Amino acid sequence: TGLKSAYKDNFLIGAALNATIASGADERLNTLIAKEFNSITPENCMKWGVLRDAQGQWNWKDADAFVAFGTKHNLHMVGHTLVWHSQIHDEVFKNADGSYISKAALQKKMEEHITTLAGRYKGKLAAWDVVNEAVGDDLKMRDSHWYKIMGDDFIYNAFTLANEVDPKAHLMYNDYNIERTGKREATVEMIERLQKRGMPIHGLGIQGHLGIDTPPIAEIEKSIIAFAKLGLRVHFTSLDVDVLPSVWELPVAEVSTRFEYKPERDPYTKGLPQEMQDKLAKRYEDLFKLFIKHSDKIDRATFWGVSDDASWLNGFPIPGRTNYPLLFDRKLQPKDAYFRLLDLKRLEHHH
Numbered sequence: 001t002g003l004k005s006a007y008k009d010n011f012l013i014g015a016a017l018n019a020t021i022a023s024g025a026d027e028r029l030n031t032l033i034a035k036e037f038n039s040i041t042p043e044n045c046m047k048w049g050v051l052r053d054a055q056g057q058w059n060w061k062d063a064d065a066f067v068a069f070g071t072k073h074n075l076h077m078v079g080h081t082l083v084w085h086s087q088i089h090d091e092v093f094k095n096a097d098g099s100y101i102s103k104a105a106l107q108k109k110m111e112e113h114i115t116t117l118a119g120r121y122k123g124k125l126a127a128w129d130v131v132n133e134a135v136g137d138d139l140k141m142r143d144s145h146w147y148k149i150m151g152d153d154f155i156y157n158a159f160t161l162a163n164e165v166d167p168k169a170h171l172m173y174n175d176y177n178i179e180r181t182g183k184r185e186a187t188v189e190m191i192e193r194l195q196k197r198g199m200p201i202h203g204l205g206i207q208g209h210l211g212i213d214t215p216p217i218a219e220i221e222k223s224i225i226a227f228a229k230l231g232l233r234v235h236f237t238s239l240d241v242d243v244l245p246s247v248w249e250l251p252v253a254e255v256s257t258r259f260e261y262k263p264e265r266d267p268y269t270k271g272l273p274q275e276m277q278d279k280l281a282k283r284y285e286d287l288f289k290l291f292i293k294h295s296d297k298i299d300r301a302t303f304w305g306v307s308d309d310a311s312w313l314n315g316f317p318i319p320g321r322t323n324y325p326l327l328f329d330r331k332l333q334p335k336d337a338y339f340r341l342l343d344l345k346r347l348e349h350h351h
């Protein structure tokens with residue numbers, strides 16, 4: 001059978017679904033998703049600035065479709081995400097003149113947002129990304145409007161509110177690059193401190209936006225172990241493997257231009273060659289070997305998309321590239337990596 005069956009005794013296997021897919025109009029994808037995945041996450045439709053306009057008005061069309069899709073197919077559903085600094089209108093935080101609103105005014109908005117959104121889907125969504133990406137790239141607290149206005153109460157209060165609204169939801173903190181030394185430990189320290197304040201938190205989401213080479217398995221392993229030691233269930237939430245030339249480590253002269261499209265940074269428009277398919281398969285295999293090793297600590301592995309045509313890495317960090325980050329190709333056919341994942345389980349040795 002599919003991935004979700006192969007990995008049944010280890011963890012959920014999930015995918016992020018965009019609004020087009022979650023409409024249910026695509027029979028081929030409906031069939032594939034039901035076969036392969038037993039968890040889903042909305043790619044965009046539950047983000048504050050997508051669900052609501054700049055006047056705070058709500059439009060539930062896509063979010064409801066997503067929840068209808070998971071309900072129809074009996075899929076575990078992860079809400080994404082209550083409190084985050086991206087894809088959210090500056091009007092939440094600022095007067096029209098640019099000045100920040102008071103902490104009290106912003107608290108009131110958070111209360112309304114969480115009570116409404118988590119309330120609507122209480123008991124239907126099994127888990128929530130309550131707060132996303134609160135630690136900055138510099139290892140200090142991210143300098144977002146949330147944080148500048150509220151301090152660490154923005155996190156504490158978000159979890160407390162979500163827990164009041166749906167006491168049964170598995171509440172998670174989610175972030176990228178927490179696979180790495182530095183940001184790992186900064187995140188451990190932040191969560192530790194909030195836990196002793198009594199903040200309700202059940203899970204820890206490692207995004208798993210990986211490169212074809214970096215980070216190494218050993219780093220990811222340290223993170224699984226460290227976050228499990230906080231008494232939290234570990235989830236891999238946004239898995240993909242970027243196979244295209246990197247702009248993350250370029251010379252200072254290129255710091256601004258590196259996000260511009262250049263042909264040499266987009267070398268596989270005609271297809272991903274077999275030798276790279278091999279490397280991608282081995283990279284995914286390595287990763288899932290690790291996950292199997294620590295299956296006792298891990299509740300879920302969700303991929304940030306189903307097939308390569310829909311991946312956000314086609315447009316990020318450079319617009320209009322042809323990337324190949326996921327398990328299914330642009331014709332929805334399984335890639336070599338998929339078969340390696342299946343055989344790790346098919347051929348597993350037990351007594």
Ligand SMILES: OC[C@@H]1O[C@@H](O[C@@H]2[C@@H](O)[C@H](O[C@@H]3CO[C@H](O)[C@H](O)[C@H]3O)OC[C@H]2O[C@@H]2OC[C@@H](O)[C@H](O)[C@H]2O)[C@H](O)[C@H]1O
Nearest residue numbers: 018043044080132176207209238304310311312314315316
């Ligand atoms: O490029 C087309 C757009 O890409 C897709 O949507 C993007 C999401 O995948 C991405 O999700 C984040 C990935 O990183 C973390 O894991 C984080 O937790 C996720 O939430 O967010 C950005 C989305 O792109 C925006 O989509 C709306 C557009 O108007 C913006 O310009 C984009 O930046 C999706 O296929 C499509 O929207």
Ligand SMILES: O[C@@H]1[C@@H](O)[C@H](O[C@@H]2CO[C@@H](O[C@@H]3CO[C@@H](O)[C@H](O)[C@H]3O)[C@H](O)[C@H]2O)OC[C@H]1O
Nearest residue numbers: 086133176177207209210211214242246248249
């Ligand atoms: O909007 C968010 C993105 O900004 C975020 O981008 C991540 C930024 O860091 C990238 O990791 C680098 C890979 O290359 C190494 O050499 C560097 O040291 C790493 O920092 C990561 O791949 C990007 O995804 O992703 C999440 C979005 O929400």
Ligand SMILES: [Cl-]
Nearest residue numbers: 018019043044
């Ligand atoms: Cl979407």
Ligand SMILES: [Cl-]
Nearest residue numbers: 267268272273
């Ligand atoms: Cl090639």
Ligand SMILES: [Mg+2]
Nearest residue numbers: 071123124125
């Ligand atoms: Mg249900």
